[PDB]
Symmetry: C3
Amino acid sequence: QMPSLAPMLEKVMPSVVSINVEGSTQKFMALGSGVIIDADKGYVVTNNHVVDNATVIKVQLSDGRKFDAKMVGKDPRSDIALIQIQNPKNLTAIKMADSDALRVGDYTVAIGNPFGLGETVTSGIVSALGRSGLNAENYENFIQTDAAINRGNAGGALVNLNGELIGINTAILAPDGGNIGIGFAIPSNMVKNLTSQMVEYGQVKRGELGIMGTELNSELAKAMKVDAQRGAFVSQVLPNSSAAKAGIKAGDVITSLNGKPISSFAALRAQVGTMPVGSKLTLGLLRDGKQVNVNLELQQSSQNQVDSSSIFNGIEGAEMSNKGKDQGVVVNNVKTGTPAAQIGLKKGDVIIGANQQAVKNIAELRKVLDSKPSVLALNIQRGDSTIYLLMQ
Amino acid sequence: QMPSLAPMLEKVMPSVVSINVEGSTQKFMALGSGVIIDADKGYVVTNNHVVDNATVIKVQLSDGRKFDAKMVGKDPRSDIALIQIQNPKNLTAIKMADSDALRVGDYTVAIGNPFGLGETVTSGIVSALGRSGLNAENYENFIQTDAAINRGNAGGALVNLNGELIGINTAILAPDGGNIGIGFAIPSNMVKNLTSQMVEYGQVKRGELGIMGTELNSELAKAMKVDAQRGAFVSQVLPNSSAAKAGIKAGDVITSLNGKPISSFAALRAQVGTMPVGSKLTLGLLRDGKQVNVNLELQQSSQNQVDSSSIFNGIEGAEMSNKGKDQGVVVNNVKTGTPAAQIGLKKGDVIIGANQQAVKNIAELRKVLDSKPSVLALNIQRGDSTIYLLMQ
Amino acid sequence: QMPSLAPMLEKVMPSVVSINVEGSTQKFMALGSGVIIDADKGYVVTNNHVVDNATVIKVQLSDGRKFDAKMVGKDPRSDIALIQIQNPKNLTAIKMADSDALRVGDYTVAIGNPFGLGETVTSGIVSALGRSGLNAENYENFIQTDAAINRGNAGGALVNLNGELIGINTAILAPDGGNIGIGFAIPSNMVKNLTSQMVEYGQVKRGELGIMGTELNSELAKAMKVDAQRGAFVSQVLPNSSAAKAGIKAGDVITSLNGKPISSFAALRAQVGTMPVGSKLTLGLLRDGKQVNVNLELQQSSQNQVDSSSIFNGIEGAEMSNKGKDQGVVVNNVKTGTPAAQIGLKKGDVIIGANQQAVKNIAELRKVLDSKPSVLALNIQRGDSTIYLLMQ
């Protein structure tokens, strides 16, 4: 009688699907993996970079079945995209684990589609936690593992021995485009927060404390007479920000969030970066070697805007986001001499509906384009006037 | 008291030898691994591609001892070759496991000679089963694993935690000629069937059902109103074939073999491709959404022929195979302007003996060449006449 | 309740630090890993090739803290260097395991700083023991493992499941500069012997049996009517050597050392090569198929000398080593037209002190240079005369 991962995998494997994609920007073809998050609705999480600029998206289960899927949401900053299987029949979803309970040394299993071979399983351990720096503009709080990960594994599952999702495989460190024992996955907690938003609104409503800062290193801790050699150093706090109102002052060092210690400023940024606006949280602070606790509430941010090419697959030069709560899709900013402004679009406009269907958020709008009508008729409102924009 | 593979390996390791080779086609040198299958006779399985075109073959045990070995059999199509240690003393053979009982997630151990370093052990898990496509003309039903495999590991052992052989390491997927976590081994069941033939006859007597077909994918299953998204689709059945006699009709889908479900057409081809002629088997079929069962018996095939260069190490342009049962080595086909026809050889000839020794099959013939006589004197028969061909 | 390495790692990880280096020979920057061996004194073992030619050495603990370290000792031949943290506060040292009790198949954990990412943990097994040949002039008796090892892992820890050090990661076999499942570590026993010397004297006092020899292979064993296919073959024994006095004769084969069987001549060389002079040992010998036992005692050797560039960071062309016991640092040999002889230095000189501080060995001397005085004033003695050499 031998130890084996097989019993655990029999239940878990159907939960991991593989994504095939065709797109354009000049035609291309790509492939990766995805994880079923809601069996009934057919929701499937995956990497944003796998499904970015995709005209066609098809999903293949472990048992051979093929489905077509449509984009639901996407977040370039965290590299997480949510798609939806069309006509979801008899699916199996994965249960998610609490990634905050992960320790280095814990065992891991990776499941995905390397080089299109098909559903492939590999094993390792958690090598490190809170890794970041791959792209300093992205929100990254990676789990690192030595379970083999290669091209095609992206969007695939990283699970513990109990077949619970702890992460989504996103990247590797490889000088040769081949795995050398260093892989990175997005923690499952971040996935829980980002996807649950996309499901309802079509995008993520980003919150902010309103503080500038940098990594607290040992040298900086000497200059500042601080004991801790790690944490978020508050460079400054913006006026009229939640942080200011809360009582946070510059020269402060943030050591914990909601009880959980903080690896770094980068990690902290990644935590709050995924939480919805109006979230009640609490911070551990260190000022003058004295421990402080504070109650905060996330607020509106300037990072909400997303490009129009992301929604019309080829219409560049217009950023736009949800408005208030279910009040339509307001256009944030418009660039001159671009495909968007060529049909009339101007910043300040608020899309009320399209083709006689009401539009409250980006999801409802995307739901009309999924229909793929020959002509698109937007009912926007400029100032006190209602107008229409026709496409094609 | 710590868990360890060491106790298991102490028994198993002597069973894995490493093969050194010199050959020509222009001299070359290669090296790999092999597994002792019969300690008494000194039989050693290995990859055909390791010992192909070899003039000299030497085997080195784990304890340092060297032996010379001679070719017994070889199958390019499945990439399995059988050699024999000369003067076998005090060897240790490996027990074989039933590879049909393998599950993805099961633990694996690989043992071989990477880069000539010596007996090396690495570990992983079964990543996938029934992988094929590396070469569409070969019979491939690979076990895939993330246990490290590199150049020199070929012909080496893949075992379970109980030190039973489950596969023979053959290949890897590596853009850089270095392992990235994707290795392939030939299932131990296929090895059991192929080698047991080579031992007795010097080659494999291939059987065939006599059916054309292709992979059953989801799209094809829609066209054909079939429920299964995987299996072998019968394009057509050859007249006077075992399949025809059995009651198999085109548009059928094969779902099982001898009870065991079928991964693919490729796998099925690989299963029967290794079974000896006259084997009694049974197939699960699906026609018009109705389950069928059928009793079949393998029959003669056209794939039996092998090149003459394979036996004379440098005599090209004459294919030949065993004849009936122990009736000599008949020549299948002869090409013009080739080294073989330059000594007289013509297709239709039947080698009765060589150098006053009787020849019943290719093994007995190879046994005379192992002697390495200065002049080779073949007693062949063309029509009703007996003649002789001299070599060197 | 899941199995995990996390509990073991929590204790062990602080024991592994990462080393940053700046040097010159033309400025360079390198990085690797190191292991804390004595928490109180702040001793840290690492690879010689990591800290070679270093002007600045800084050490970063797991918790973020930075320290400066200074060279204590270094051995190019075994590739082991010892450094010392300056102002050691609240450190955690690692317990060492007996590497002679290692078996292939035993589980291993690697801990180091690949590509500067930070403290990274990976896992594998012992693939092989006593590997050597990477550099035939070095003393190598490597443990081989498939735990992922990459650039930056050097000097890092290799431990068993109990968090005991079994080796120090030194090298990998990689055609692409990326890990493919083949890593090498220096056994912990060799580290125990080499470092304990450097701590006291600043270098290793090498001992020798005084015997020429080569690897005993199967072919050589045939020629010599020997049964063993492995061991050290005595080509000849030097007169007035410990071996000669002991009763060792050419044509002998050494099979054991202090009871422990011998993998190879290379391994044997590596064992005694790390033992201090005057060590009492015993050898198992085979002569004329008869088992012999012998009592030996290591003696002075010619390999003691080390370059002057190693101690003055840029002063080439003068070899020098300790003298007798704590009698100063004698200069072995001097080359003409070199930076050393340009200040006067001549072979035969014995450094009694520097800058009014007494000098007994290379460690005490290195301790004066750690002060980094503007001018260095050596009190050497040529013949019966005492003189001084000034620097800068």
